[PDB]
Amino acid sequence: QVQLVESGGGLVQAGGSLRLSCAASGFPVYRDRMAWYRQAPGKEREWVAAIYSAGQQTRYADSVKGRFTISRDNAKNTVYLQMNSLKPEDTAVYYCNVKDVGHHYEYYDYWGQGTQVTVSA
Amino acid sequence: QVQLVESGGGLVQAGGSLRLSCAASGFPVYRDRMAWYRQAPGKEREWVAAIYSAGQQTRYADSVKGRFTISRDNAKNTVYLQMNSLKPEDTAVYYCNVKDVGHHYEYYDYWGQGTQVTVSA
Amino acid sequence: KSWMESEFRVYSSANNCTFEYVSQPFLMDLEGKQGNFKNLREFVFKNIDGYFKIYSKHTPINLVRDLPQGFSALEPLVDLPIGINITRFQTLLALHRSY
Amino acid sequence: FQPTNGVGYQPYRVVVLSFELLHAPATVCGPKKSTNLVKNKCVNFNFNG
Amino acid sequence: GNYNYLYRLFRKSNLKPFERDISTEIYQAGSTPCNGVEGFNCYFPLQSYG
Amino acid sequence: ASVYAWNRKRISNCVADYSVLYNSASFSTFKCYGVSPTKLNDLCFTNVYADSFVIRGDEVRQIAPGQTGKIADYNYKLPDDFTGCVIAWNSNNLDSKVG
Ligand SMILES: *[C@@H]1O[C@H](CO)[C@@H](O[C@@H]2O[C@H](CO)[C@@H](O)[C@H](O)[C@H]2NC(C)=O)[C@H](O)[C@H]1NC(C)=O
Ligand SMILES: *[C@@H]1O[C@H](CO)[C@@H](O)[C@H](O)[C@H]1NC(C)=O
Ligand SMILES: *[C@@H]1O[C@H](CO)[C@@H](O)[C@H](O)[C@H]1NC(C)=O
Ligand SMILES: *[C@@H]1O[C@H](CO)[C@@H](O)[C@H](O)[C@H]1NC(C)=O
């Protein structure tokens, strides 16, 4: 059974740093694409980040480029998600997401629990 | 054009009678040949049964004689497969197969979704 | 007093090759020697309907000028089933570098 | 490509051989059929075409 | 659609002039004898017109 | 290589034994279109393109002229007048990994 868990986050003041961990069991992280989304209270959901093992290394939202990095490790089978110099606009819930294809070309998205990150100015 | 859907199957105790219905749309069932195939994990595909409209009507494997029966219904365009006195070795995914000819000599082996059949001793 | 391959300035890049062949192994003296000519090597290169034919002949001669009087026939050497298109050619010569 | 997945989703290695002939010499040839030769008999022969 | 019209697809050799063939034996495409049993390298020689 | 980056190899100037491949019986699918499987050993070809990739089993039949699907449409499309053969074999004993 494929199970994904997110660790990290919390409430921090402005200028801090955070390190989220997305751990997946049942399948190696060395695959097509991992995704991370952000959900703010009372706001619309939008794609944020994605890491790929082929083609372009990573893709990011226009609001998160230049201050946010990601890495993966197949040996221990976990993805680290580092954010530096946090801003108040980053206060939201982080979601880790993966995708799989079925027998009849149907797509199953494994959704993560996510963690709340609050930045206080 | 040609659509094949299988209905029936499941898990049964050995010695019972089971029904499979292959519904075909886009072509009348009265044609050259309707086949039934089974596939199991770890082994190659083999021909199981067939029914013809010319010459000998039905052909079966030498080891399955007298246990499986096939029939056709032109009014609702369906293929009926009644299997009795099953054995645990028959646990496999079954498909109803037809063969169609293209304009440029291409030949298509149109199958359905298939149904899984398990027999418990 | 040894000679070894140092420079291959025939091409800068090789893209989308289609054929490669290697003849018998050998080891030919690369040391520069002076004196009168002693070896005459004749070749014929033809490119007909996809085949590149190379005919060859080797002759030891004892002379200083002109061609030998006798008649020599060139034996076929190699056939190339390549089918490339040829209108020009050139000779690749190995220069010498020393003190 | 999980070990417990179905045969339809099992990994399969596929190689397609495409054979092209142009205004160029034929390069790839199939194996030749060799038959024992017999002498001093009126026989049908085929040597390299 | 009409599939009542049949044509033979596999045969060992070409038909002699004005020959009629009605056999429905499975053609042995490979080396394994079909023996009236289809499968790999064993296909029904008759096909219907689409 | 991946199916979208299907590996292409050029074969030329050699003897290709197709009787052993045909009689190997180790390949699940062997479908030749435009050529005679028995006459493969009896013909000479200017060039051979070997197109290698790995797919799922159900898409094995999709590698054929006139077939449709994600792989056929976006990865490798065979022309309706394709001249060649397709050989597919299961690789579970070699491509099975934990997880
Ligand atoms: C790999 O090479 C072998 C031999 O060089 C080929 O032959 C078969 O190999 C399998 C497993 O290695 C054996 O079970 C068979 O008995 C061999 N012979 C035949 C006629 O199948 C083999 O086809 C090559 N390819 C693969 C994918 O194994
Ligand atoms: C001569 O010396 C050079 C370098 O000192 C070396 O590369 C070369 O192989 C030598 N020649 C022989 C014949 O050993
Ligand atoms: C390889 O593709 C074709 C075939 O010769 C040719 O047009 C091309 O120049 C070749 N070389 C490349 C793409 O570098
Ligand atoms: C060689 O010239 C062009 C390509 O450079 C080609 O179109 C032409 O057909 C060739 N000629 C011959 C005689 O092969």
Judging contact as 3 or more Cβ pairs under 8 Å, the answer for F and A is yes
Q: Which CATH superfamily is domain A3-119 in?
A: Immunoglobulins (2.60.40.10)
CA B119 – CA B85 distance, rounded (Å): 10
Dig out the tokens for F18 from the structure: 């197709």
Q: Between the CA atoms of D15, D16, D20 and D26, what dihedral angle is there, to the nearest 10 degrees?
A: 40
Interface probe, candidates D1, D9, D28, chain F, greatest F C-beta count within 10 A: D28
Give the burial string for C17-36 (b: 16+ CB within 10 Å, else e).
Answer: eeeeeeeeeeeeeeeeeeee
Domain boundaries, chain B: 3-119
Give phi and psi for A90, each to the nearest 5: -85, 0
Q: Name F84's Cβ contacts closer than 8 Å, sequence gap at least 6.
A: D16, D17, D18, D19, F32, F33, F34, F35, F49
Ligand 1 interacting residues, C-beta cut-off 6 A: F 24, 26, 89
Of C18, C9, C13, C15, which Cα lies nearest the Cα of C85? C18
Identify residues of D whose CB sits under 8 angstroms from chain F CBs. Answer: 1-3, 6-22, 24-32
Q: Solved by what technique?
A: cryo-EM
Contact B32 E46 (CB under 8 A): yes
Report the half-sphere exposure of B70 (CA within 13 A, side-chain side). 21
The pair of three-digit structure tokens given for residue F4, joined into one six-digit string:
């979208």
Chain A partners (3+ C-beta pairs within 8 A): D, F
For F94, which DSSP code? H
In the three-class reduction of DSSP (H, G, I as helix; E, B as strand; rest coil), residue B84 is classed as: strand
- Picking from C15, C16, C17, C18 by the largest number of F CB atoms within 10 A of its own CB, the best residue to mutate is C18
Counting every residue written for chain C, the total comes to 99
B-E Cβ pairs (cutoff 8 Å, strict) = 50
In a 3-state reduction of DSSP, which class is residue B88? helix
- Identify which of C16, C17, C84, C85 to mutate to test ligand 3's pocket (most ligand atoms within 8 A of the CB): C16
Asked whether the beta carbons of F99 and D27 are under 8 A apart, the reply is: no
Which residues does residue A120 pair with via DSSP β-bridges, in sequence order?
A13
State the DSSP string of E1-50. Answer: -----EEE---SSPPPTT------PPEE-SSS--TT--BTTEE-SEEE--
Angle at E6 between CA E2 and CA E9, to 5 degrees: 135
Query: Locate tokens 């994600």: which residue?
Result: F70
Cβ < 6 A, ligand 2 pocket: C 2, 4
Are the beta carbons of C28 and C41 closer than 8 angstroms? no
DSSP structure class, residue A90: G
Whole-number Cα distances in Å, B23 to B17, B30, B34, B49: 20, 13, 12, 17
Ligand with an atom nearest the CA of residue C15? 3
Element (H, E) at F92: helix F92-95
Q: What DSSP line would sit under B6-30, residue for residue?
A: EEE-EEEETT-EEEEEEEEESS-S-
Decide the pairing of beta strands F14-15 and D28-29: parallel
What's the CA gap between D14 and F90, in Å, rounded? 9
Strand, coil or helix: what is B106? coil
DSSP state of B60: E
Is C6 near ligand 3, meaning CB less than 6 Å away?
A: no
Q: Does C68 touch chain F (CB under 8 A)?
A: no
Tokens of D49: 């075409």
Q: What is the 3-state secondary structure (H, E, C) of F14-78?
A: EECCHHHHHHCCCCCEEEEECCCCCCHHHCEECEEEEEEEEEECCCCCCCCCCCCCHHHHHCCCC
Contacts of B2 in chain F (CB under 8 A): none
Question: Chain B partners of F91 at a C-beta cutoff of 8 Å?
Answer: none
Element (H, E) at A109: strand A107-111
Beta bridge partners of D31: none
C-beta of residue B61 within 8 angstroms of C-beta of residue B49 = yes
Q: Can you read off the two tokens belonging to residue A35? A: 């995704």
